[PDB]
Design an enzyme around this catalytic site. Structure first.
Site, PDB file in Angstrom:
ATOM      1  N   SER A  39      55.094  19.288  20.851  1.00 35.02           N
ATOM      2  CA  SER A  39      53.791  19.699  21.321  1.00 35.02           C
ATOM      3  C   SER A  39      52.893  20.385  20.328  1.00 35.02           C
ATOM      4  O   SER A  39      51.749  20.642  20.673  1.00 35.02           O
ATOM      5  CB  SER A  39      53.929  20.642  22.479  1.00 35.02           C
ATOM      6  OG  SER A  39      54.165  19.942  23.646  1.00 35.02           O
ATOM      7  N   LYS A 201      50.398  27.438  18.749  1.00 34.73           N
ATOM      8  CA  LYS A 201      50.649  26.291  19.638  1.00 34.73           C
ATOM      9  C   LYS A 201      52.139  25.990  19.412  1.00 34.73           C
ATOM     10  O   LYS A 201      52.565  25.680  18.266  1.00 34.73           O
ATOM     11  CB  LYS A 201      49.838  25.047  19.247  1.00 34.73           C
ATOM     12  CG  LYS A 201      50.071  23.918  20.307  1.00 34.73           C
ATOM     13  CD  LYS A 201      49.881  24.423  21.761  1.00 34.73           C
ATOM     14  CE  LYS A 201      50.281  23.354  22.855  1.00 34.73           C
ATOM     15  NZ  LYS A 201      51.729  23.381  22.974  1.00 34.73           N
ATOM     16  N   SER A 202      52.926  26.106  20.481  1.00 36.15           N
ATOM     17  CA  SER A 202      54.375  25.885  20.385  1.00 36.15           C
ATOM     18  C   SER A 202      54.806  24.420  20.720  1.00 36.15           C
ATOM     19  O   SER A 202      53.989  23.603  21.162  1.00 36.15           O
ATOM     20  CB  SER A 202      55.091  26.881  21.296  1.00 36.15           C
ATOM     21  OG  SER A 202      54.852  26.670  22.667  1.00 36.15           O
ATOM     22  N   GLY A 203      56.064  24.064  20.410  1.00 36.71           N
ATOM     23  CA  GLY A 203      56.528  22.743  20.754  1.00 36.71           C
ATOM     24  C   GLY A 203      58.015  22.786  20.986  1.00 36.71           C
ATOM     25  O   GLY A 203      58.701  23.680  20.464  1.00 36.71           O
TER      26      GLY A 203
HETATM   27  C1  LIG Z   1      55.614  19.938  23.836  1.00 30.75           C
HETATM   28  O1  LIG Z   1      56.445  20.233  22.999  1.00 30.75           O
HETATM   29  C2  LIG Z   1      56.053  19.504  25.215  1.00 30.75           C
HETATM   30  N1  LIG Z   1      57.435  19.037  25.276  1.00 30.75           N
HETATM   31  C3  LIG Z   1      57.814  18.067  26.119  1.00 30.75           C
HETATM   32  O2  LIG Z   1      56.995  17.442  26.808  1.00 30.75           O
HETATM   33  C4  LIG Z   1      59.340  17.682  26.180  1.00 30.75           C
HETATM   34  C5  LIG Z   1      60.181  18.684  26.956  1.00 30.75           C
HETATM   35  C6  LIG Z   1      61.123  19.488  26.297  1.00 30.75           C
HETATM   36  C7  LIG Z   1      61.835  20.477  26.976  1.00 30.75           C
HETATM   37  C8  LIG Z   1      61.623  20.689  28.326  1.00 30.75           C
HETATM   38  C9  LIG Z   1      60.693  19.891  29.015  1.00 30.75           C
HETATM   39  C10 LIG Z   1      59.980  18.888  28.320  1.00 30.75           C
HETATM   40  C11 LIG Z   1      55.806  20.713  26.096  1.00 30.75           C
HETATM   41  N2  LIG Z   1      56.679  21.816  25.661  1.00 30.75           N
HETATM   42  C12 LIG Z   1      57.639  22.058  26.770  1.00 30.75           C
HETATM   43  C13 LIG Z   1      58.429  23.358  26.572  1.00 30.75           C
HETATM   44  O3  LIG Z   1      57.897  24.371  26.142  1.00 30.75           O
HETATM   45  O4  LIG Z   1      59.665  23.274  26.741  1.00 30.75           O
HETATM   46  C14 LIG Z   1      56.890  21.953  28.109  1.00 30.75           C
HETATM   47  C15 LIG Z   1      57.847  21.834  29.289  1.00 30.75           C
HETATM   48  C16 LIG Z   1      55.943  23.142  28.321  1.00 30.75           C
HETATM   49  S1  LIG Z   1      55.914  20.429  27.910  1.00 30.75           S
END
Ligand SMILES: *C(=O)[C@@H](NC(=O)Cc1ccccc1)[C@@H]1N[C@@H](C(=O)O)C(C)(C)S1
Length: 257
Positions: A39, A201-203
């Site tokens: 993300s 902005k995290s991911g």
């Molecule tokens: C960005 O990195 C998004 N990641 C995903 O859509 C995949 C994912 C990974 C783990 C759990 C659920 C979905 C967003 N980042 C995650 C997170 O912070 O874990 C969200 C659930 C907010 S969507």
């Protein structure tokens, strides 16, 4: 050195690129190693759209239909059959990491292929967008798909946001979202000195405990940001990340400045 130690403490892999935009001073560690950006790519897409649409024109609405909806869209999930402004799309993408908002931003920009074109114009021939969300989240150490190196990603973040085709208003609107984003609080925000302002902005990718945080960090007193890109991951597909790893890596990196 101490980052290797943190790689040992957390049995994880750290990718770091940090640039003090005032001095041009850089901290690098596994900076040319590929990682799923997950993300964190939302900041890049948001900024590219903002290069093309003036602040005043963020009021333009766009239609949302069922086909656009992808998983983890807490905001956009309620816009099926409705219109949403580009401003609210960006806000959704940045504040809630709304996946549907991010795909629609990429569409607005003109598609993956156009993001690729912009990337190459910024001299970034590494960041490699291939899929939309959430498919881009299926990281594999064996594929380059939707990955970048901390160095390529930070340089782009620097050329796109830190200096500087963005108007004052669009630059302020994006950074404020990033500053106000409470979902990155356990990452860089957690490791920086409490009087530093952090616009992140995290991911988190689905696989290999791929946990990232990118930020514009303002050490108290300085207005020029330090671009900080921390990408981490682990050896196993189902590994769970430890945000404290990123918090510690940020703490460590900030002492370098
Ligand atoms: C960005 O990195 C998004 N990641 C995903 O859509 C995949 C994912 C990974 C783990 C759990 C659920 C979905 C967003 N980042 C995650 C997170 O912070 O874990 C969200 C659930 C907010 S969507």
């Amino acid at each position: 050195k101490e980052l290797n130690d943190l790689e040992k403490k957390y049995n994880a892999h750290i990718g770091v690129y940090a640039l003090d935009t005032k001095s041009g001073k850089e901290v690098k560690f596994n900076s040319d190693k590929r990682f799923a950006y997950a993300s964190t790519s939302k900041a890049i897409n948001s900024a590219i759209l903002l290069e093309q649409v003036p602040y005043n024109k963020l009021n333009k609405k766009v239609h949302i239909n069922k086909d656009d909806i992808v998983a983890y869209s807490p905001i956009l999930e309620k816009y099926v059959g409705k219109d949403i402004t580009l401003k609210a799309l960006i806000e959704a993408s940045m504040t809630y990491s709304d996946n549907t908002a991010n795909n629609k931003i990429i569409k607005e920009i003109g598609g993956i292929k156009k993001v690729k074109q912009r990337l190459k114009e910024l001299g970034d021939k590494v960041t490699n967008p291939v899929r939309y969300d959430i498919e881009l989240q299926y990281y594999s150490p064996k594929s380059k798909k939707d990955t970048s190196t901390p160095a390529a990603f930070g340089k782009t973040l620097n050329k796109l946001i830190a200096n500087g085709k963005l108007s004052k208003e669009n630059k302020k609107f994006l950074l404020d979202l990033m500053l106000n984003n409470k979902s990155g609080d356990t990452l860089i925000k957690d490791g920086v000195p409490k009087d530093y302002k952090v616009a992140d902005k995290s991911g988190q990718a689905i696989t290999y405990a791929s946990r990232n945080d990118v930020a514009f960090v303002y050490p108290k007193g300085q207005s020029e940001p330090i671009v900080l890109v921390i990408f981490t991951n682990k050896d196993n597909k189902s590994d769970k990340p430890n945000d404290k790893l990123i918090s510690e890596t940020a703490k460590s990196v900030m002492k370098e400045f």
